[PDB]
Every structure is written in structure tokens, then in C-alpha cells.
Design an enzyme around this catalytic site. Structure first.
Site, PDB file in Angstrom:
ATOM      1  N   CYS A 173      -2.178   8.629   2.796  1.00  0.00           N
ATOM      2  CA  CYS A 173      -2.089   8.011   1.474  1.00  0.00           C
ATOM      3  C   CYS A 173      -3.331   8.334   0.663  1.00  0.00           C
ATOM      4  O   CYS A 173      -3.252   8.664  -0.530  1.00  0.00           O
ATOM      5  CB  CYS A 173      -1.906   6.499   1.603  1.00  0.00           C
ATOM      6  N   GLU A 218       0.871  -1.172   0.000  1.00  0.00           N
ATOM      7  CA  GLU A 218       0.000   0.000   0.000  1.00  0.00           C
ATOM      8  C   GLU A 218       0.906   1.219   0.000  1.00  0.00           C
ATOM      9  O   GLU A 218       1.600   1.484   0.987  1.00  0.00           O
ATOM     10  CB  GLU A 218      -0.949  -0.017   1.181  1.00  0.00           C
TER      11      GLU A 218
END
Lengths: 477, 477
Positions: free
Chosen positions: B285, B251
Site C-alpha cells: 500500500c 486502510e
């Protein structure tokens, strides 16, 4: 022997399938026959520029093909399966000619392709409602990963291409396929047959002169790499896909063990063991390469196996009496000769043990007993019809020596008590544990390797999920 | 500001959790406070030998832990959630202290940890029977992947550690975890809290001095790597895992775009956009980094946004009035200053635009309009509270400028017409498309990135299956 081919193979011109057109290669490669060691055909080999052309064509075809929908892509897969059925014997002959396997094994390859293709032609992936409460609406959609670069090896060329091809296309991806340099014939020929069935650029095939692979696996345009081959090459592929963060699916071969239980029927398991240990001249990722028999059965099993191994008929795969063909290529042949020398040095050879006096890469089916357990024969992977039977004193000892390998791709357990056999099979550290057979692949069942044998799963819902990305749509109400 | 801690943090000795014991670090590291840029604690840093110790302990605990069964691992996970609940305020204080986010956000993180842990503590994976006919019996089993190496960033230290830990452990894995070098505090403290809750070696934590990650990702003992971090590092990590053919979940952060439709409610939409674009000081993110507004709404939307952005109260996270804290570390602060100059150079700043003159990494929340679309501000990821609003003339123009990025982690669409909003959300090349909100993570729904933003899935059935391997047991009758 001579062919059932409807055309003259030596003079036939082959093109690469790029964007719905047949494109001549930047260079051409001769195709030998392993059964005679003689040139039989010429196939195109692509340049870096032609690889870029094919990748670009697949990208161009991507949005329309994905927008087409499951039902209409389904018609295209069914049409491809029809073409396979219509040219079933032709494609099987071509596969025997370049790969070297018995014509019957090749017929099974084409049949397998047809059935995998039809299964996935009818596959459907639906949106999932993961949440429908007062506050939220969440659906999981599965969208195509993108352009798939598929790389296929030389043991099962056409079948391995089709089983990568069918699930990738049904879900909406486009594909560029690079066959092995020593086996492009059946793949190029199939590509020519489907050039008008498949929409232009959805499927493209490029010839490999031995250098194209690293270029494909690091290509900017490729979104997923589906690779079948050696474990060393697989490690290189994973490193090469790193900078581009590619999706990766890897079939990498193994050292499959078969453990025979004290209660096994000698004749039935000797039949299966011979079949799966020597299928395709031992050149199968999931071949039975190590047999473990308890002290009670070691002598009768080894004797039944040697009888069967010696009865095998070695010859050109086009001869209908042939049961075991040659190894596929010169490098495989040299590795087999080294295996034969190791067999004589580290064990007692009870069947075969020599190179055949034949033009071509023929190796006698070889059965070895009393093998030294750190011999490279059993420690390293042997892609040849040289097979070893090893004695074990305890079930725990057998299981731990079966698992004492980096591979863990496949395994089988042979005995009359099936639940004891299943419990033993669960203890094998592998992707698939077969019980009273070995090496069964069906489109509805996941096939994958753990440890150093693979990363993902190739068939099933697990496999179709390998060709898609998850897209979540989450609405706040 | 004043601590709610029951103990003196500056004097507290912290140990790494290896094999059920607290192990002093090979080296020590100062832990700074983003709010003041002053040392507040000292934490242990592991040597490569200590990483080997932790991986070996995890390997040792693996067979017993996996054998333990789902219900007994479930009780352990619930005890961990209870320990999180018992120390809720304590861990929130520590994570505000080292990460720097507002205390309310730290309490949200700990609550998220508790809920993820419970959801996964109740998860069960059972064998699936793929075939039960007269001729064959095929069942699918899911086995633990093995030892998992976890690497977590500085955005949500304790939460990211827990959301990797809970799904990995429930299925039978063991884990070795390395927190971010600049955010080890809450992770180490919680690890001490669970040293005896978790059976020895099932969970191990090792301190990073900036060198450990590459060592961990290529480690022979690790079977799977779960990495959250920068895209550049993720590329290195995938390359590094190549030789070992490691299972990988990555990720890697993104450039989330929000598209606002002409029918959107300006006040509701300005509130939502400000909230999700500046949460955690933009250091997410999946944060909203690009807002696209239609011409009809551009001016009123920009002023509502600018008013709300300028209203944000900047200060230390422990202060209850603080809305936006400092950025986590010195290099992030430096990159924020570089973003401020790109902002002045390439756009019109309507709110903030500078760093406050205070000890510590405080940056004013900044809003930029009329941005040059080839400016790196919008092309590259900005882990800082600098955000841009850009005009679009066509919905298709907005969608393609949203997708003209290498990232694809998340995106959102804002409008009154929810079915039209979903049609738009589906056109985004992202893992998750939020409609009328942004940044919603729940344990039952998959979170993942496509393109250069990720490889696997984090939660749900996808993602928990990421922590297992498929084992097919196929019996021929």
C-alpha cells in the site's frame, strides 16, 4: 405575541452566505411560527448550482484560511462571539419564533453558542514529538480535514450550527452549512451578521427546500460531513458518503433512561426529572425519555412528577410566563398525537394527555404510568412531551431494561449515595452518564453516542481531533 | 525448493478457529504457491452460518474478556508473542510459501508481529479526570467497542492479522478475522497455534471463498470493522456498514510519491529508492510508486536506479539468493502484464519490462523514464514491480504533481538539507511523510491515510483509541 425585533421580520429579505456575499435563493421558502401556525418570514432555498458555488468557494478559501494560523483565526472566532453577544436577544427571539421554544431556553442557546465559540477561539493544537532519539525524529502534526459540510436539525438550530462551526474553523477547515428546512431563520440571520467578520468562503450557508441534504453529503468537494439528526437519516448519510470515503461525525438521537435509586430524595429528583424530561418539549436527542423507579418510590415519585407536569404552563415561547412551547412542526405534531393515543391505550395517563385548543402545535405535557413494556411509546424514540415512568424490582433488571435499546446516547442515575450511583452509571451502555442531573454539554467535555446513536465525539480534544487529520513527519538520521 | 516444515503441508488438515475450537470448513479451498502456480495446501472456507457462529462466540466472550482486566489480558498477549517466537521460522516459511515474498522478508514480517504484539501487550488506558471541583466531577472512561471484524489483504497476511489483533484485544475487544482468500495459510496455522493460548471466542478466524467480506462488514453482531484492502472495496465496505452505523477503520492503499531534492546523495538515494519501490515486489500500500527528480540529478539518478533494478535477482522466495519474488496471485499477475504494456506504450523502459517464461507469476522488475504524466501507470496504483522516474522543473511543480492523485497514503522526500526536506514533506497531502527513507511502521507512531486512502489511524494512541469508545461519567455535586 409581538417581538422585541428592531426590524420588520415579515418583509426582511434574506440571502444565503456564499463567498462573503448575500446571494438570493433559486427559490424561496415561507417560515412559519409553531406557536401560531402562521407565516412569519421568507428565506432563500438554494439550487444544486448554488450548492456547487458554495462548495467551490469553501475550497478556494481553504489554503489561505489554513495558512492563517491559530492565532489569527482566533481573532475571527472572537469577533463572531462578539457579534453573538451584541445580537444575543435578537437571535434568541428569532430562534423562539421559528423553533418554538421558550424565550429563556433560546437565550440559553445563544449563551451556549457564545461560550463554545470563545472556548474554541482559545484552543491550540501543537506538534507532538513522538520520537527524538539518535536514529529518528518523528513529529505528529494535526492538519485540517478540509471542507466540512455541516447539517443541522430543528431542535437547537443556531446553537448546533455554532458548535459545529467553532471547532471546525479554529483548526483551519472551511464550512458549508445546511440548516433544517423548517428552521433556517436564526441561522440565515446569524450568517448575515458575520458575513464581513469571517473571511469570504470560509463559512457559507445554503437554504434547504427539503432535498439539498443528500446532494451535500455526496458532494465531490466535501471532505467531512458533520450531521445531527435522526438515526434513519444518519444511516442514509453513511451510505451516501461511501463512494467518496468521507470523514463522518454523526449525532443521531436516542432513548435516554433515568434510573432512580431507593435512597433518592423525592423532591430534588422529581424536579430534575421534570426539567430534563420535558426540556424543549421533549425534542432533545439526549432528553430523559424513560424513567425507572423502584417499587419503594414509584407512587410518591409518580405523584410528585404529575404535580410538576400539570403545573407546567404551555403557551407561545415569546410569552415570559411560558414554560413549555409547541412542538416544532406539523409532522412532529402528528407524531405527538399518535403518542397520546398510544399513551391512553397502553398505560394510565396521570398528567395531561391531550392536544391543546390553541392555534399551533401545542401538546399538553403528558405523564404516563403502568405502561406496557413492549409499547412503542417506550420501545421507539418519542420526540414529544409524552413521558413514561416504569417500575422495576431489581437494580439489575432496571439496568438491563435501560440498556435494552438500540440507542445508547445518554443516561442518568439519581440517588443520594453518589458512588453507588456512579457504579450504576458506568453500567449504562451510553456515551455520557450523568449522575444527579442530565443533559450537560460543555466544550471541554466529549459528547458522543454509541450503538445506533452516533459515530464520533463532538466536543473536547476527542472532538477537535475529529476535525483534523494526523500527518506524521518521520525522519531517519 | 525444500521446506523447513516439520510436517507435510499438502496433507495437513486445517480448521477455522471458532469459539476456542477447530471447526472444519463448510467448503475447502486449494492454496497455490505463487512461485510455481501449483497447489501446496488445502484450507477451510466458512459458510454464512459459520460467520454467525464466530460472531456469536465473540459476543459471548466479550463480557468476561473485558472484565478480565488489563494485566490478565496482557499475559495472554505475551503468550501469543511467545508462540510467534517459538514458531518464528515455521511461520516465515509458510508465509513465503503462500504470499511468495523472499524468506528474509517473511522473517521480517514475523519479527514485526512479535514486536507489535509486545508493545500493545504493555499498553494501558486509564480514566482521565476532566473536572474535579466543588460543583462537578467528570471522568472519561474508555470502554471496548465490542466485537471487531477484521479483514486483511494478501500483502502481509500474518503481520496485518496480528497488528489488527493485538491493539484490539488489549483494550478488551473480541475479534472475528477473515484473511484474504489467496493468503489464508499462515493465518490459519498461527490461529491453530493459539487456540488454547487465547480464551475461547476472544479470537476467531473464518475462511473466505471470495464471498465472506460483504457478509462480515454488514453483520448485525459486529460493532467495528477494521478493513485493509483496495480503495474500491473500501468504498463498498463503507456503504455496506451504513445501515448498522458501524465504527470503521479503512486502510486502502495509495500512490506514494518520492521527491528527490537537488542536493540529494545520488548513491544513497538510489539505494533507498530501489529498496522501498521494489520491496515485496511493489505490492505494498505504502510502496514508492512515483519518483520525482530535479533536472540536475535526473540522468545520473536514473542510471544508478536502472543499474540497481537490473541487479535484482528474481526467483522463488524460499531460495536464499532471491531478492524479488513473484506477485502473489493470478489476477495481480494479469494486471502486471497490463502495466508492462502501458509502460512500453507510454514510456521508455530502462530496466526489465517483461515477465519471465516460468510456471508462476514472475515479472522482471521494471524501471520507466520519460513517462506520459496522464498515463494510467502514474495516475493509478500499480501493485507490481513497475516504477517510474519523472522529471520536475520546479519544487512547487514536483509537490503539486505528487499531490495530483486521489490517494495520499504516504510520501517521502530525499535530500541533504533536512530542514528543507521537512518543509517539503509537510507540503505532501499524505498520512505519513518519510524524510530520507520510506515505509517505516512502528507500533507507537500513527499510520493512516487521507483522501481516498483511508479513514482512521492504525497504531499509537490514535488507532488504539479507535478500538475503544468514550464513556463520560459526569456527576453534579
Amino acid at each position: 405575541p409581538n417581538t422585541a425585533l428592531s426590524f420588520d421580520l415579515s418583509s426582511k429579505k434574506y440571502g444565503q452566505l456564499i463567498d462573503g456575499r448575500l446571494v438570493d435563493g433559486a427559490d424561496e421558502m415561507p417560515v412559519l411560527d409553531p406557536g401560531t401556525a402562521a407565516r412569519i418570514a421568507t428565506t432563500p432555498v438554494a439550487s444544486s448550482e448554488q450548492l456547487d458555488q458554495a462548495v467551490q468557494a469553501a475550497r478556494r478559501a481553504l489554503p489561505g484560511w489554513a495558512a492563517l494560523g491559530y492565532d489569527e483565526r482566533s481573532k475571527v472566532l472572537h469577533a463572531v462571539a462578539d457579534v453573538l453577544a451584541a445580537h444575543h436577544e435578537e437571535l434568541a427571539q428569532l430562534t423562539t419564533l421559528e423553533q418554538g421554544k421558550p424565550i429563556g431556553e433560546a437565550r440559553d442557546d445563544v449563551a451556549w453558542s457564545i461560550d463554545f465559540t470563545r472556548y474554541f477561539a482559545d484552543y491550540r493544537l501543537d506538534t507532538e514529538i513522538l520520537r527524538d532519539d539518535a536514529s529518528s525524529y518523528v513529529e505528529l502534526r494535526r492538519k485540517p480535514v478540509g471542507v466540512v459540510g455541516a447539517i443541522t436539525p430543528w431542535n437547537f438550530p443556531l446553537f448546533q450550527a455554532v458548535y459545529k462551526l467553532a471547532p471546525a474553523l479554529i483548526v483551519g477547515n472551511t464550512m458549508v452549512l445546511k440548516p433544517s428546512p423548517t428552521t433556517p431563520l436564526a441561522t440565515m440571520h446569524f450568517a448575515e451578521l458575520v458575513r464581513e467578520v469571517i473571511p469570504a468562503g470560509v463559512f457559507n450557508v445554503v437554504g434547504d427546500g427539503g432535498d439539498l441534504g443528500p446532494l451535500l453529503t455526496s458532494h465531490e468537494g466535501i471532505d467531512k460531513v458533520s450531521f445531527t439528526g435522526s438515526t434513519v437519516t444518519g444511516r442514509h448519510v453513511m451510505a451516501a458518503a461511501g463512494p467518496t470515503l468521507k470523514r463522518l461525525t454523526l449525532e443521531l438521537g436516542g432513548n435516554d433512561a433515568a434510573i432512580v435509586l431507593d435512597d433518592a430524595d423525592i423532591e430534588k429528583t422529581a424536579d430534575g426529572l421534570c426539567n430534563w424530561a420535558f426540556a424543549n418539549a421533549g425534542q432533545v436527542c439526549v432528553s430523559i425519555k424513560r424513567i425507572y423507579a423502584p417499587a419503594s418510590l414509584y407512587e410518591p415519585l409518580v405523584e410528585a412528577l404529575a404535580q410538576r407536569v400539570s403545573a407546567l404552563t404551555v403557551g407561545h415561547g415569546l410569552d415570559p410566563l411560558t414554560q413549555l412551547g409547541p412542538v416544532q412542526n406539523a409532522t412532529a405534531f402528528q407524531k405527538a398525537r399518535e403518542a397520546l393515543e398510544m399513551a391512553a391505550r397502553d398505560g394510565r395517563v396521570v398528567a395531561g394527555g391531550e392536544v391543546l385548543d390553541q392555534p399551533g402545535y401545542y401538546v399538553q405535557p403528558t405523564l404516563v404510568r403502568d405502561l406496557d413494556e413492549n409499547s412503542p411509546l417506550v420501545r421507539e424514540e418519542t420526540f414529544a412531551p409524552i413521558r413514561s415512568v416504569m417500575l422495576y424490582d431489581d437494580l439489575d433488571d432496571a439496568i438491563e431494561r435501560a440498556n435494552d435499546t438500540q440507542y445508547g446516547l445518554g443516561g442518568s442515575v439519581w440517588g443520594s449515595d453518589v458512588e453507588r450511583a456512579i457504579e450504576v452509571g458506568a453500567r449504562l451502555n451510553v456515551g455520557t452518564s450523568w449522575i444527579n442531573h442530565h443533559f450537560q454539554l460543555t466544550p471541554d467535555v466529549p459528547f458522543g453516542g454509541i450503538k445506533q446513536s452516533g459515530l464520533g465525539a463532538e466536543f473536547g480534544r476527542s472532538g477537535i481531533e475529529e476535525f483534523t487529520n494526523v500527518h506524521v513527519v518521520n525522519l531517519k538520521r
